């Protein structure tokens, strides 16, 4: 039973690793880059106008 419990704990650790994969893939900097892309684009457009 302890063997099965430790295997379940290892599976839970793997699930935690997958969740940390999810949060790492989440890891906003790219979104700020997109926002500044829009910023430089529209400043360029205003400059042309």
């Amino acid at each position: 039973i302890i063997r099965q419990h430790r295997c379940a704990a290892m599976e839970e650790a793997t699930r935690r690793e997958q969740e940390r994969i999810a949060v790492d893939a989440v890891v906003r900097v790219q979104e700020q880059d997109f926002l500044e892309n829009l910023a430089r684009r529209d400043r360029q457009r205003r400059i042309m106008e």
Binding site: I2, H5, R6
Partner: protein
């Protein structure tokens, strides 16, 4: 009957007490709300109430509210009393002077009042169980003050103190040697028996025996709580050779000023390793006497065994107890002091140790805890003395203590007392 009152002082004390009390509750079958669904075995740790609820005979202290508030917000909040859970407003912060002179006195009176309220209930109080690491300011200062008050107001009741001394290699403070040297004086004079609990030994034991790459503070506290439960189960459960607090402290303390004792618990084996080995009594005794299985960074071969006590739990029989003792005596690798021929204490219990869910330990037929007074403590005392003296050469981290309200000569007094400890150890261990 046979009550034992637990005090957990400081951050380290509270964390180790958490694991110790979870182990006590699991082994006594007490739910976290404080009830036993389905025998006066808990009487030493839990006070039975009229409503049917069991309240532990514990007192948590810390000048910083973090650990006590974590306990209050934890699962065992219903178990633990709203009182006996004292908190401060600002921590000692690695300052024995703070913990002993300025912020310790504003809380020591309440601590003594709570201790009185927990002791007048007790009718057969065996003694006190003080868990505190001397590295911290409140573990050293507040612990020292509380020990002084308890000793002066409670007579000669037995007092065991589990202390996590500054480990010789790894440490988490620079003022920690100062705190250890300062608190050693009080711990010597007022604590009846002291138990070494340094960190490298426990951590290496967990790395090698338990085969886990991340041994952490929870695992260390779990092991320490297992040791405490093994030591104190003799009065909790019926055994072939019952020993009480006085019973083993008399056999463990040869002289009043030498009571510091080494500890080693085994079989401390990994779950995977558990059923692939024939854990016999002789095998576990040999594993305990192996230096690698000790929970203190003091190798026995550099010292002299003086008086060793073995707490056996499980299906152990006096047969195998005596056979293991005979084999250990025949082995020449370990050496006992000449003037103490027997040098062996044995206490047998039929209650096997219990393993908490999620713990690294594995439940076994039998186990044994070694508590031994030996000369090996002199070397760790010398290591911390060398840790301290070169720092004290030109007053490093001393203005804090000077301005906090401590006289400068107290450091020299603590240095001299510690040096007296090593010299007394050497004198007693010297051959007749």
């Amino acid at each position: 009957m046979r009550e034992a009152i637990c005090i957990h002082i400081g951050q380290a004390g509270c964390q180790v007490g958490n694991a110790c009390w979870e182990l006590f509750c699991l082994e006594h079958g007490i739910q976290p709300d404080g009830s036993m669904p389905s025998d006066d075995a808990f009487n030493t740790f839990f006070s039975e109430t009229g409503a049917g609820k069991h309240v532990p005979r514990c007192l948590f202290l810390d000048l910083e509210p973090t650990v006590v508030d974590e306990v209050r917000t934890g699962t065992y909040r219903q178990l633990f009393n709203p009182e006996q859970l004292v908190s401060g407003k600002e921590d000692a912060a690695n300052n024995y002077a703070r913990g002993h002179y300025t912020i310790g006195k504003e809380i020591v009176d309440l601590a003594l009042d709570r201790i009185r309220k927990l002791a007048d209930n007790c009718t057969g109080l065996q003694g006190f169980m003080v868990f505190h690491a001397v590295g911290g300011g409140t573990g050293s200062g507040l612990g020292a003050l509380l020990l002084e008050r308890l000793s002066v107001d409670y007579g000669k009741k037995s007092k065991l103190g589990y202390t996590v001394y500054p480990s010789p290699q790894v440490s988490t403070a620079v003022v920690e040697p100062y705190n250890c040297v300062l608190s050693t004086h009080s711990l010597l004079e007022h604590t009846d028996v002291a138990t070494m609990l340094d960190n490298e030994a426990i951590y290496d034991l967990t790395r090698r025996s338990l085969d886990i790459e991340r041994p952490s503070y929870t695992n260390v506290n779990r092991l320490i709580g297992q040791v405490v439960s093994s030591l104190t189960a003799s009065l909790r459960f019926d055994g072939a050779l019952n020993v009480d607090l006085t019973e083993f402290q008399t056999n463990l303390v040869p002289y009043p000023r030498i009571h510091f004792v080494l500890t080693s618990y085994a079989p401390v084996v990994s779950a995977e390793k558990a059923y692939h080995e024939q854990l016999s009594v002789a095998d576990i005794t040999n594993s305990v006497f192996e230096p690698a299985g000790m929970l203190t960074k003091c190798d026995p071969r550099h010292g002299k065994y003086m008086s060793c006590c073995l707490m056996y739990r499980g299906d152990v029989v006096p047969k195998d107890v005596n056979a293991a003792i005979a084999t250990i005596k025949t082995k020449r690798t370990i050496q006992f002091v000449d003037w103490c021929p027997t040098g062996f204490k044995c206490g047998i219990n039929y209650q096997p140790p219990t393993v908490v869910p999620g713990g690294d330990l594995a439940k076994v037929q039998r186990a044994v805890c070694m508590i031994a007074n030996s000369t090996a403590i002199a070397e760790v005392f010398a290591r911390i003395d060398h840790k301290f003296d070169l720092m004290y050469s030109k007053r490093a981290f001393v203005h804090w203590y000077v301005g906090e309200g401590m006289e400068e000569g107290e450091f020299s007094e603590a240095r001299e007392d510690l040096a007296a400890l090593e010299k007394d150890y050497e004198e007693v261990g010297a051959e007749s």
